[PDB]
Amino acid sequence: RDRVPTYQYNMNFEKLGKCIIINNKNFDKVTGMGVRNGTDKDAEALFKCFRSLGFDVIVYNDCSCAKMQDLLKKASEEDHTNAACFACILLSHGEENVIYGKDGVTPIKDLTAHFRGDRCKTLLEKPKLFFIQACRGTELDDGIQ
Amino acid sequence: TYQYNMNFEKLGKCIIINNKNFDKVTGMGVRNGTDKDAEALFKCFRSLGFDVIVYNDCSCAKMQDLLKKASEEDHTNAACFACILLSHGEENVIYGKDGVTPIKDLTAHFRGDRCKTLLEKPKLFFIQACRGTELDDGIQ
Amino acid sequence: KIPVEADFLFAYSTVPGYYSWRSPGRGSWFVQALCSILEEHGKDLEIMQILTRVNDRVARHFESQSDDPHFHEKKQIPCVVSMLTKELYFSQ
Amino acid sequence: KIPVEADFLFAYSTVPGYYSWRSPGRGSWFVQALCSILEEHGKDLEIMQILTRVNDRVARHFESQSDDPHFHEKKQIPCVVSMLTKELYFSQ
């Protein structure tokens, strides 16, 4: 449509921003979770795609919960001053409000909290995008029509 | 092709539930100013083309009935449906005047498999209630 | 065949867990913001554009002032949950 | 000031409490769709338009089919949660 004055995020920075992809395919036997066949295909399609948009993308594979927390926390402590935004894509097993690491479960809220305005001042007023591909329960949609 | 079809006789029904006075058993105080909001909202939505009706200090059964009945009406000639809930709230629930009811229970009535005449039509819910007690301190 | 959860949109005055501010004299922030944006753009902007503007207005133009230090200079950000599958315009 | 929750956008592959489909050979529905729309319009559509289109794609184009009748012919609808205060374009 019409790109009206400043109703749009300023995209005039040195770079578009960092894009972190967490590709969790294999999980510890104890978690009861199985292999997520087809996830590498998503990780490849996604990485190419976000690189095309101008993002500096990084792909992480089979991360533990501690690793995801740490990896995201260090990403929030970087200097994003010259970045237009930040993106994070999580590909894994999930249940309501939680996402699976290879060794267990961690709250999605805790992962994204690292980037709140009071905890990541260099991404203040900048869009923080999270694309999440994980189940959120067991209920299946039967449809209609 | 990318926009909902608004080519209908009516824009749609708009239910405004305006809870201001709650039972003592709930321990919730009067929601001063909610009437100011309800009126402003009534003009806006009416002005957009909604056939809006305002229900006051509804009980939890009342709100369930209002939404159930509304979902059972015939919206064939309606472009969409809208509901506005002004009340006290808590994570995942809204306050009736006699207690609390799950939001998912109020909206469920309009699911595709429960309201055929709204299938593929937008169903809008504007909730002005609390969702917790945490406060946003802000930054910079 | 279409999902039974599709085409729903929820606009909450606030994000999950936080307090929603309301001025007993001028009504809540969310409603004040929603009405002004709607009165001026309800017929030319797509639903998400409107709600985004409401988000901005509530985020900026508002900041509480209370006696108790616990409620002073507090902020608020509305939340939009969308399952819409098309753009929504209240016109034409 | 700015709310600590502002400027966040969550695009979940499925609505709260449901299941998300994925092909062992094709990749998941949500991702296939997302990448498709982004290739084509990523640089000329606002983020919400892109995600609304992804919502339509997953909702229409797909439907499961397993040997098990319980997981047979099921639908999926993505879910977007926005706390953004401006429109987002990845270009210009």
Keyword list:
heterotetramer; A: 145 residues; alpha/beta; Rossmann fold; four-stranded parallel β-sheet; three-stranded antiparallel β-sheet; 3 helices; 7 strands; 26% strand; globular; C: 92 residues; alpha+beta; Alpha-Beta Plaits; two-stranded antiparallel ribbon; two-stranded antiparallel sheet; 2 helices; 4 strands; 14% strand; Caspase-7 subunit p20 (chain B); hydrolase; protein structure
SSE topology:
The complex is a heterotetramer, with two copies of chain A and two copies of chain C (92 residues).
Chain A: E1 15-23, H1 39-52, E2 56-61, H2 65-76, E3 83-91, E4 94-95, E5 98-100, E6 105-107, H3 108-113, E7 128-133
Parallel strand pairs in A: 1-2, 1-3, 3-7
Antiparallel strand pairs in A: 4-5, 5-6
Chain C: E1 8-12, E2 22-23, E3 27-28, H1 29-41, H2 47-59, E4 79-82
Antiparallel strand pairs in C: 1-4, 2-3
Helix pairs in contact in C: 1-2
Short description:
The complex is a heterotetramer, with two copies of chain A and two copies of chain C (92 residues). Chain A is α/β, with parallel strands linked by helices and 145 residues long.
Describe this structure in words.
The complex is a heterotetramer, with two copies of chain A and two copies of chain C (92 residues). Chain A has helices at residues 39-52, 65-76, 108-113; strands at 15-23, 56-61, 83-91, 94-95, 98-100, 105-107, 128-133. Chain A has 145 residues and is an alpha/beta fold. Chain A has one domain: Rossmann fold (3-Layer(aba) Sandwich). Chain A is globular, with a radius of gyration of 17 Å. In chain A, 39% of the residues are buried. Chain C has a single domain (1-92), classed as Alpha-Beta Plaits. In chain C, a hairpin with a 3-residue loop joins strand 2 and strand 3 (27-28). Helix content of chain C is 28%, strand content 14%. Chain C starts with 7 loop residues before the first strand and ends in a 10-residue tail after the last strand. Chain C has a two-stranded antiparallel sheet. In chain C, strands 2-3 form a two-stranded antiparallel ribbon. Chains in contact: A-B, A-C, A-D, B-C, B-D, C-D. Strand 7 (123-128) of chain B pairs parallel with strand 1 of chain C.
